[PDB]
Amino acid sequence: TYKFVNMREPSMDMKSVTDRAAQTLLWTELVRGLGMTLSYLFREPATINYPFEKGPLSP
Amino acid sequence: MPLVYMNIIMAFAIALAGLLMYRSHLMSSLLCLEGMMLSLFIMSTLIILNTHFTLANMMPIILLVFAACEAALGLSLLVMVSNTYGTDYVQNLNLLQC
Amino acid sequence: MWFEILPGIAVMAACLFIPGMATAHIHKFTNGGKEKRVAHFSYQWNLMERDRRISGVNRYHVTKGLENID
Amino acid sequence: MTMYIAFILSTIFVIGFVGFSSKPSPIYGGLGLIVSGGVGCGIVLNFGGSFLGLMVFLIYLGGMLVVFGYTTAMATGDWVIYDTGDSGFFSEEAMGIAALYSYGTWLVIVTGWSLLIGVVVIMEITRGN
Amino acid sequence: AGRIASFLKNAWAKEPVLVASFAIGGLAIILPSLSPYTNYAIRINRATPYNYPVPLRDDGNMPDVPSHPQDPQGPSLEWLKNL
Amino acid sequence: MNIMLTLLTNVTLASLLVLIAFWLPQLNAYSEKRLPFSMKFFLVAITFLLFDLEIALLLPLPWASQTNNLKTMLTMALFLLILLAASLAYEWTQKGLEW
Amino acid sequence: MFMINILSLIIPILLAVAFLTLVERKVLGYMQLRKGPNVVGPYGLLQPIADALKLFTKEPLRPATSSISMFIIAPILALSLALTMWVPLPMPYPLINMNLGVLFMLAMSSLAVYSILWSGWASNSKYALIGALRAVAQTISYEVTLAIILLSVLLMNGSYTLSTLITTQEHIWMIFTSWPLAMMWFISTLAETNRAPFDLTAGPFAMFFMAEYANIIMMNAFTAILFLGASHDPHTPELYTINFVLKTLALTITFLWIRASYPRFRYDQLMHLLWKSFLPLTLALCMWHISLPIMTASIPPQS
Amino acid sequence: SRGEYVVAKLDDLVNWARRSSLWPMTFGLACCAVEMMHMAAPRYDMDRFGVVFRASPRQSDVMIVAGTLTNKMAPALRKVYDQMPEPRYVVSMGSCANGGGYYHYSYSVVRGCDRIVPVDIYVPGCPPTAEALLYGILQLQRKIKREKRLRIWYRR
Numbered sequence: 001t002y003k004f005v006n007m008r009e010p011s012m013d014m015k016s017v018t019d020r021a022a023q024t025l026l027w028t029e030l031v032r033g034l035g036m037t038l039s040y041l042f043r044e045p046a047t048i049n050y051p052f053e054k055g056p057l058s059p
Numbered sequence: 060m061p062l063v064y065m066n067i068i069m070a071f072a073i074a075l076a077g078l079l080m081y082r083s084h085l086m087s088s089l090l091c092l093e094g095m096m097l098s099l100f101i102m103s104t105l106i107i108l109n110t111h112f113t114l115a116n117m118m119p120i121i122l123l124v125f126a127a128c129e130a131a132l133g134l135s136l137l138v139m140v141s142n143t144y145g146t147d148y149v150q151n152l153n154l155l156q157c
Numbered sequence: 158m159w160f161e162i163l164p165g166i167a168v169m170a171a172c173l174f175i176p177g178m179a180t181a182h183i184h185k186f187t188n189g190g191k192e193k194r195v196a197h198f199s200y201q202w203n204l205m206e207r208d209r210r211i212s213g214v215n216r217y218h219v220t221k222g223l224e225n226i227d
Numbered sequence: 228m229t230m231y232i233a234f235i236l237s238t239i240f241v242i243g244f245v246g247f248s249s250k251p252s253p254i255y256g257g258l259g260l261i262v263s264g265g266v267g268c269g270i271v272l273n274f275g276g277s278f279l280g281l282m283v284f285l286i287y288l289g290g291m292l293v294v295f296g297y298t299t300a301m302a303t304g305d306w307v308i309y310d311t312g313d314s315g316f317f318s319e320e321a322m323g324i325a326a327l328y329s330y331g332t333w334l335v336i337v338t339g340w341s342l343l344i345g346v347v348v349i350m351e352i353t354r355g356n
Numbered sequence: 357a358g359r360i361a362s363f364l365k366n367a368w369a370k371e372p373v374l375v376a377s378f379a380i381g382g383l384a385i386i387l388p389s390l391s392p393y394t395n396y397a398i399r400i401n402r403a404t405p406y407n408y409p410v411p412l413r414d415d416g417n418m419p420d421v422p423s424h425p426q427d428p429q430g431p432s433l434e435w436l437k438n439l
Numbered sequence: 440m441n442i443m444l445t446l447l448t449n450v451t452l453a454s455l456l457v458l459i460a461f462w463l464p465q466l467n468a469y470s471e472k473r474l475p476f477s478m479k480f481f482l483v484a485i486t487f488l489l490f491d492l493e494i495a496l497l498l499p500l501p502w503a504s505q506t507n508n509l510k511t512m513l514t515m516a517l518f519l520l521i522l523l524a525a526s527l528a529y530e531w532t533q534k535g536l537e538w
Numbered sequence: 539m540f541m542i543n544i545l546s547l548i549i550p551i552l553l554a555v556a557f558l559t560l561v562e563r564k565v566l567g568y569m570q571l572r573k574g575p576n577v578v579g580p581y582g583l584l585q586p587i588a589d590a591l592k593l594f595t596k597e598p599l600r601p602a603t604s605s606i607s608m609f610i611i612a613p614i615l616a617l618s619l620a621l622t623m624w625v626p627l628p629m630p631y632p633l634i635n636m637n638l639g640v641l642f643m644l645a646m647s648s649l650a651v652y653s654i655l656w657s658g659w660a661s662n663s664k665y666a667l668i669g670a671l672r673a674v675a676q677t678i679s680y681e682v683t684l685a686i687i688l689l690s691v692l693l694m695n696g697s698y699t700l701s702t703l704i705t706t707q708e709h710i711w712m713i714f715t716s717w718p719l720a721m722m723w724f725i726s727t728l729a730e731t732n733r734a735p736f737d738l739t740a741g742p743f744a745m746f747f748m749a750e751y752a753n754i755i756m757m758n759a760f761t762a763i764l765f766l767g768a769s770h771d772p773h774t775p776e777l778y779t780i781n782f783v784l785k786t787l788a789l790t791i792t793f794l795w796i797r798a799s800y801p802r803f804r805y806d807q808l809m810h811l812l813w814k815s816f817l818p819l820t821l822a823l824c825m826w827h828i829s830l831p832i833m834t835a836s837i838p839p840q841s
Numbered sequence: 842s843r844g845e846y847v848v849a850k851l852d853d854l855v856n857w858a859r860r861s862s863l864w865p866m867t868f869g870l871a872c873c874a875v876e877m878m879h880m881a882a883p884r885y886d887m888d889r890f891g892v893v894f895r896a897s898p899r900q901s902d903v904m905i906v907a908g909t910l911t912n913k914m915a916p917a918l919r920k921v922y923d924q925m926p927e928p929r930y931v932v933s934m935g936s937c938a939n940g941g942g943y944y945h946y947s948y949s950v951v952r953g954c955d956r957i958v959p960v961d962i963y964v965p966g967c968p969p970t971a972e973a974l975l976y977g978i979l980q981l982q983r984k985i986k987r988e989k990r991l992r993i994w995y996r997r
């Protein structure tokens with residue numbers, strides 16, 4: 001079985017075209033990326049305090 | 060006639076003479092023309108401001124605009140001349156002789 | 158955590174606080190405890206020159222009150 | 228009298244024009260012209276022409292000499308003649324300059340047409356072929 | 357009728373910036389000639405005293421010219437206060 | 440005077456601090472061991488120059504709005520901006536803004 | 539006491555720039571699930587000092603063939619212009635009260651490209667020259683729209699005086715009156731300072747770096763003054779100073795955020811962006827903002 | 842006397858400044874570079890030590906050789922080393938860079954990067970772990986701390 005990754009056709013009604021124009025002019029997806037980064041700032045980092053803390057190992 | 064106007068006219072005459080020398084580098088010819096228009100702008104502005112000719116304050120800006128437009132044209136021409144020879148030397152334009 | 162960025166930012170804030178505030182204080186100290194007089198348009202400059210002459214101490218900031226009208 | 232500051236400014240202007248009038252190493256000539264333009268702008272500003280001096284310093288220096296240097300990079304006494312009164316609550320220079328839109332309709336028309344023709348002429352000349 | 361609407365719909369897609377710019381420019385050209393406040397702006401410019409009002413020499417034949425600023429005759433600025 | 444003093448101070452501080460930066464590592468001893476001329480870049484500069492000239496023409500607008508002849512000044516300002524847009528459009532349609 | 543005022547304006551900006559780098563590294567690190575420098579000093583507070591000392595004690599690599607004149611002059615011009623452009627700004631009171639302050643800043647920003655041109659041409663390399671040419675072209679291209687947007691916005695202020703902007707925004711910010719111009723202005727300021735997504739390009743290198751970072755801070759401060767008006771009370775200017783500094787810090791952190799959030803443009807892509815999306819919209823909105831006060835009888839006073 | 846005290850204090854300040862901000866340029870020659878990029882990853886966060894991520898050769902302080910050095914690449918590495926400002930250090934990361942490693946007896950491999958450039962720190966392993974490389978970088982910091990230039994100039 002196989003899937004299509006980029007086989008969508010954008011709608012050409014007035015509402016869809018207006019939505020795409022609003023995206024182009026007001027930079028909505030750029031704001032979405034900014035929001036993702038902003039949210040990702042307010043979470044705890046993954047850094048450990050070497051050499052006072054050490055990475056996990058195995059026997 | 061004060062000494063400042065005489066100094067500006069001397070500067071313009073020096074720029075014109077340097078334009079007329081033509082050591083090389085037609086780019087220097089354009090530079091001399093732009094120095095000439097700069098001296099013109101400065102002295103015209105000084106004269107107009109001094110006599111309080113309020114409506115004449117239009118004239119320097121106009122001059123500047125037009126002169127700069129001329130410079131653009133000249134630069135374009137230079138490029139094409141260089142585009143034929145690779146250098147902007149004056150002596151390369153010896154094809155036409157009197 | 159994220160608040161560990163706050164110290165350095167605070168330093169920047171302090172560095173950005175110094176200029177403006179300083180100017181104001183200097184404008185209070187050089188201009189006799191008042192705002193520095195702005196002079197565009199050449200009429201305010203005439204007002205300042207008239208103030209300088211009337212005081213007698215050659216300073217525009219000193220203000221001659223009504224008490225000087227006799 | 229600050230030793231006739233305008234006199235020193237004019238002399239430095241003349242010295243700069245003499246300096247690049249020998250046209251040595253055209254970038255050095257352009258830098259001499261930059262210094263000369265700065266000196267002339269200082270002359271105009273000290274005279275009292277703030278707006279016209281700033282027009283010089285912006286348009287001339289930042290556009291025209293910048294484009295000149297860019298293309299080259301591609302390749303290889305006083306104080307006596309002045310006034311007595313004041314100007315009001317405005318600057319006469321600004322009023323006279325802004326009169327271009329109310330008084331100078333003809334000037335605006337001819338300058339705009341000339342600039343449009345300049346753009347067209349530049350395109351045609353640089354077309355090549 | 358249909359062709360114009362089709363052209364505008366095709367331009368609103370894949371060229372929204374140009375459509376917006378042309379619309380804004382056309383509105384800026386058209387609207388001032390229809391607004392009633394442009395005359396108000398002209399009048400406001402007229403009422404801004406930049407110069408000293410030089411008095412007129414009286415000859416007894418100017419009933420419309422006041423002798424004092426508090427006199428009723430002369431231009432008024434109550435409309436500007438109402439604005 | 441004040442502007443001259445400020446400019447002199449800024450230039451002097453920059454020059455002194457550049458010189459100390461350039462001379463502090465020069466006191467200690469160490470080892471101490473073309474043509475193409477693209478044509479589009481010239482058109483970009485020329486277009487910038489022309490549009491800067493038209494901006495210079497547009498600059499007196501803040502004072503132009505108090506003239507009592509508002510209709511004429513509005514017409515002339517709109518005319519100047521229309522011709523600026525026309526220059527941009529002509530250079531656009533003639534393939535002057537391509538790479 | 540004018541010398542003291544000049545020094546108290548000129549030194550804190552340099553300190554602010556040094557600490558900005560720590561903030562930029564620290565802000566970016568926490569945005570990437572890590573930390574910034576937190577070892578040199580209590581919270582990385584000593585990192586800028588160590589960086590400065592190391593850079594000042596490192597050998598300078600003079601090209602051994604370049605024009606020493608322009609090689610020295612270019613950082614001088616960069617620092618001089620960067621420090622000069624702070625003089626006109628009013629926080630609340632400006633160091634120098636210029637009638638045409640905005641025009642003066644425009645002229646200085648126009649000069650700013652000579653340092654790039656001279657650094658490229660004195661580098662004695664064809665590739666660095668090509669890069670410098672690209673940078674200069676981008677800078678002039680975006681300063682065109684900067685100037686047009688700036689005059690369109692000032693059409694509601696009534697003059698080129700920077701202090702009057704405080705009087706204009708005593709009741710409402712300028713961002714509400716014209717946000718699209720503010721959007722294009724923000725993008726144009728990003729593209730002017732060669733900041734991501736437009737970042738296509740020992741001692742003198744540090745000089746250029748401080749010049750660029752000071753220009754970044756000054757651009758954010760000018761944007762905050764122009765579009766986010768802070769209320770000024772004449773009897774206590776400290777409140778205005780605090781508000782202005784907070785807004786400037788927010789805008790600088792927004793630049794860092796945008797750097798951390800996006801990929802970068804190609805050269806032709808940003809050229810097309812400007813010349814085919816910003817210039818037409820800028821001209822249309824300039825026409826609109828010329829005609830708007832006349833339509834509404836809301837012309838600003840000063841003339 | 843005070844003459845030795847002042848130079849000792851200035852030397853300590855200079856050493857602290859140099860070791861508290863080490864700017865490396867990294868030759869990502871092979872598989873060792875992948876652990877290099879894990880030392881810049883959020884878990885270890887090289888940047889928190891003052892070690893900047895991917896500095897330019899013109900303003901770099903330490904050279905990290907991470908991977909096999911072939912004969913075809915040695916002149917380029919030597920040129921890049923020669924193009925560095927004087928206070929420079931070289932860290933040999935991994936077994937291939939240390940002694941040729943698992944291609945030691947090869948016709949096209951330099952048997953150790955120290956045939957080309959002098960090496961300050963040798964980091965063992967194939968590849969050495971991110972923590973191991975961090976340990977090596979920290980060790981280089983201590984070595985820089987131990988050096989003394991103003992004192993030597995004073996006694997000379």
Ligand SMILES: CCCCCCCCCCCCCCCCC[C@@H](O)O[C@H](CO[C@H](O)CCCCCCCCCCCCCCC)COP(=O)(O)OCC[N+](C)(C)C
Nearest residue numbers: 329330331332333336337339340508510511512514515518
């Ligand atoms: C009559 C000839 C027509 C055919 C020949 C055309 C020749 C060349 C075209 C240019 C001529 C156009 C006439 C404009 C002359 C300017 C004077 C006239 O227009 O009066 C002005 C009136 O202004 C009008 O608004 C002029 C508007 C017309 C200009 C707009 C478009 C112009 C385009 C013409 C060709 C340009 C290039 C091609 C573009 C397609 C003055 O304003 P006013 O208020 O009374 O007085 C001001 C002085 N105050 C302050 C003391 C009171």
Ligand SMILES: CCCCCCCCCCCCCCCCC[C@@H](O)O[C@H](CO[C@H](O)CCCCCCCCCCCCCCC)COP(=O)(O)OCC[N+](C)(C)C
Nearest residue numbers: 577579584587588591850851852853854855857858860861
């Ligand atoms: C105003 C005039 C300026 C003139 C120019 C000077 C520029 C500014 C000078 C100020 C610089 C601050 C220096 C402070 C550095 C000390 C930091 C301290 O924490 O270091 C400790 C002590 O280390 C060193 O011994 C410190 C020596 C630093 C110099 C000491 C005094 C120097 C002052 C002399 C200044 C006079 C200048 C005269 C010429 C103008 C240990 O840190 P370190 O080991 O790394 O990290 C270990 C990491 N662990 C903990 C996680 C394991």
Ligand SMILES: CCCCCCCC/C=C\CCCCCCCC(=O)O[C@H](COC(=O)CCCCCCC/C=C/CCCCCCCC)COP(=O)(O)OCCN
Nearest residue numbers: 024025027030376380718720721722724725761765796815
């Ligand atoms: C009733 C009277 C009203 C009068 C009419 C007014 C109506 C206004 C309607 C339109 C206004 C919108 C204009 C805003 C600017 C739009 C420009 C634009 O859309 O250009 C984009 C380009 O925009 C960008 O790509 C810029 C992205 C740069 C990265 C910056 C990140 C954005 C987020 C940062 C926050 C922004 C903060 C703004 C406020 C700043 C305050 C100072 C188009 O590019 P493409 O989508 O690739 O298509 C072109 C091919 N045909």
Ligand SMILES: CCCCCCCC/C=C\CCCCCCCC(=O)O[C@H](COC(=O)CCCCCCC/C=C/CCCCCCCC)COP(=O)(O)OCCN
Nearest residue numbers: 367371374375377378379381382524527528531818821822
């Ligand atoms: C006299 C009015 C002026 C005032 C308004 C305008 C001011 C500034 C705007 C104009 C600036 C110059 C614009 C230059 C136009 C050039 C167009 C062009 O040639 O580009 C075409 C595309 O242009 C077109 O699409 C043709 C016209 C499209 C529509 C233009 C507007 C027409 C009317 C639309 C709005 C009408 C009024 C608004 C009402 C809308 C409802 C609110 C090709 O695009 P490429 O970039 O080459 O693509 C190649 C890569 N894929």
Ligand code: SF4
Nearest residue numbers: 871872935937967968
């Ligand atoms: S040393 Fe080991 S891990 Fe590193 S490149 Fe060589 S074989 Fe791969």
